Enzyme design. Structure first.
Site, short mmCIF file in Angstrom:
data_model
loop_
_atom_site.label_atom_id
_atom_site.label_comp_id
_atom_site.label_asym_id
_atom_site.label_seq_id
_atom_site.Cartn_x
_atom_site.Cartn_y
_atom_site.Cartn_z
N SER A 134 0.76 -1.31 0.01
CA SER A 134 -0.04 0.01 0.08
C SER A 134 0.94 1.20 0.07
CB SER A 134 -0.76 -0.02 1.27
OG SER A 134 -1.78 0.93 1.41
N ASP A 210 -8.93 -4.98 -6.18
CA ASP A 210 -8.61 -4.19 -4.79
C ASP A 210 -9.42 -3.32 -4.45
OD1 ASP A 210 -7.10 -2.27 -3.04
OD2 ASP A 210 -5.38 -2.91 -3.82
N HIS A 247 -7.21 -6.07 -1.59
CA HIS A 247 -6.07 -5.45 -1.04
C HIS A 247 -4.95 -6.04 -0.24
CE1 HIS A 247 -3.78 -1.73 -0.70
NE2 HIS A 247 -4.18 -1.39 0.58
#
Ligand SMILES: CC(=O)N[C@@H]1[C@@H](O)[C@H](O)[C@@H](CO)O[C@H]1O
Ligand SMILES: CC(=O)N[C@@H]1[C@@H](O)[C@H](O)[C@@H](CO)O[C@H]1O
Ligand SMILES: CC(=O)N[C@@H]1[C@@H](O)[C@H](O)[C@@H](CO)O[C@H]1O
Ligand SMILES: CC(=O)N[C@@H]1[C@@H](O)[C@H](O)[C@@H](CO)O[C@H]1O
Lengths: 288, 288
Positions: A134, A210, A247
């Site tokens: 991320s 995601d 994610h």
């Protein structure tokens, strides 16, 4: 009417704005002056760095793990890359910029730059790999773009679900949440400074499904996780539309582990297609 | 989890890369240091400047005309804005960067910056309007972006068929032709430095049927002649699809004259929609 076979070089005042473009002298490279000064005392930055079973100033084969938004290093990687990298022979190290990566991404980057400086020297002045999730990838690329000193200290970047263009999915919010919103001043600056082109050998593994970072559906430069010249691996391009890791699955799945392991051991610094195929399209956790 | 109602300010090393974006302190403005030095001797730059019936160092109500690629000031404006501006009460002045605007656009810009410095002082330290065609608008915006000193000396910009994004229409070529090709290092630099947002009050008049500069068909930010916050006038948006003025017609038509006259006299510095309508959608030459 004069004529030539190349575009004139940009004058000094303008080259920082065309990194990656080719003129008569060649491809315009990133500015390489001194590192910007840190806003945080070095002792504060050091407090955010930890290595498993070792001091960052004397460590063997370190790997620097940079966490995602709203988490600490242990929260992001305890169940996955801390034990997986240890099993691959590295000493897992991580930064946990306070509070939970929610503050200014530029400050979170100071923690990473300081950590690389520290681990490079601590491992005998040897380059080390950086693995991220991320915002951690945005932090890595921000550091490589604006802190010249670490470009020769990182041998490769393995970024899972990096949000280099921020996200379009999304009121009063945390500082770094403002910065990761697509159209933000921070993401604009990274792009305009040439940051959407890889600086060190980079592999970006991400997913069209995601639920935090979008857009990621095109398997092209439009995707938030894409870097020019990088090894951009959208999971569905390899695994098909029924492969739907989210994610966090982008970081922890068996597919993600196979690609990451490939990137970490590759002599090119990037994952290699020859190292993974349909059989590795496994959405189950690698550490399981 | 901390929270705020604005995006954190960018650190000094990064703000030049997010001009126009809003952070807690407000909209990030253009850098404002000293002007880059000229590569050409000032006497060489002065030789490229001429005013009709006057010396640029002592002139009344000057208007600086910047020509298009492959032309001199007289070739671009003799049949149009030199006599039209004189009739409006200005002293027409122009630059003719050698050879015919074919050399490095960055050098052509030195001629314009020097000219504005000269005409500002020559007219009693009063701001003056700049009117351009083709590359002339790219030169004007390049100068305003990278030479801070002239931002307070130009009161408005009236650009006809400006190619701020270059052109996609198009071997060995002239230096400035390389630079005006879309994707060039020069157009990339202008955009990345914040140059696609107006700096002084600007009016851009252009045509979807321009045979030299494309794309210009969307009447939106995608068009090469578009500047954020500017008065962007795509002729067909006002006149319909049967109005088909070309690249030069964008400069010389009666419609173009009505819009330009509006921009030159407007107290806002930009043309006003109330000053033109369907009756002015005349493709015949204004000076005729
Ligand atoms: C845990 C932590 O560092 N808290 C910081 C605080 O010290 C600082 O005043 C503010 C903006 O600088 O951001 C907070 O998140
Ligand atoms: C906005 C855009 O042009 N990007 C499209 C995306 O919307 C689409 O879902 C994807 C399909 O794979 O292809 C991309 O080129
Ligand atoms: C008329 C003129 O200025 N000719 C210049 C020449 O002096 C210069 O060597 C070259 C590149 O700098 O570009 C030419 O167009
Ligand atoms: C590539 C693109 O998205 N731009 C389109 C353009 O191609 C089209 O001709 C025009 C119609 O007015 O609308 C724009 O939005």
């Amino acid at each position: 009417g004069p004529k030539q076979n190349c575009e004139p070089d940009l004058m000094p005042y303008a080259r920082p704005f065309a990194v990656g473009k080719r003129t008569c002298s060649g491809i315009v490279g990133l500015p390489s002056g001194s590192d910007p000064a840190f806003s945080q005392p070095k002792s504060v930055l050091d407090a955010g760095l930890t290595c498993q079973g070792a001091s960052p100033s004397s460590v063997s084969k370190p790997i620097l793990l940079v966490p995602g938004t709203g988490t600490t290093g242990p929260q992001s990687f305890d169940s996955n890359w801390i034990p997986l990298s240890a099993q691959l022979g590295y000493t897992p190290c991580w930064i946990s910029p306070p509070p939970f990566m929610l503050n200014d991404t530029q400050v979170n980057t100071e923690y990473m730059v300081n950590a690389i400086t520290t681990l490079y020297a601590g491992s005998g002045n040897n380059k080390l790999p950086v693995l991220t999730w991320s915002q951690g990838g945005l932090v890595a690329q921000w550091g490589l773009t604006f802190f010249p000193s670490i470009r020769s200290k990182v041998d490769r970047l393995m970024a899972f679900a990096p949000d280099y263009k921020g996200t379009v999915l999304a009121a009063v919010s945390a500082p770094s949440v403002w910065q990761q919103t697509t159209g933000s001043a921070l993401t604009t600056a990274l792009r305009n400074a040439g940051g959407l082109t890889q600086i060190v050998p980079t592999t970006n593994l991400y997913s069209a499904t995601d639920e935090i970072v979008q857009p990621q559906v095109s398997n092209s430069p439009l995707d938030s996780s894409y870097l020019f010249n990088g090894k951009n691996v959208q999971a569905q391009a390899v695994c098909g539309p029924l492969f739907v890791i989210d994610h966090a699955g982008s970081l922890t799945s068996q597919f993600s582990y196979v690609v990451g392991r490939s990137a970490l051991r590759s002599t090119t610094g990037q994952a290699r297609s020859a190292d993974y195929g349909i059989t590795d399209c496994n959405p189950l956790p690698a550490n399981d």
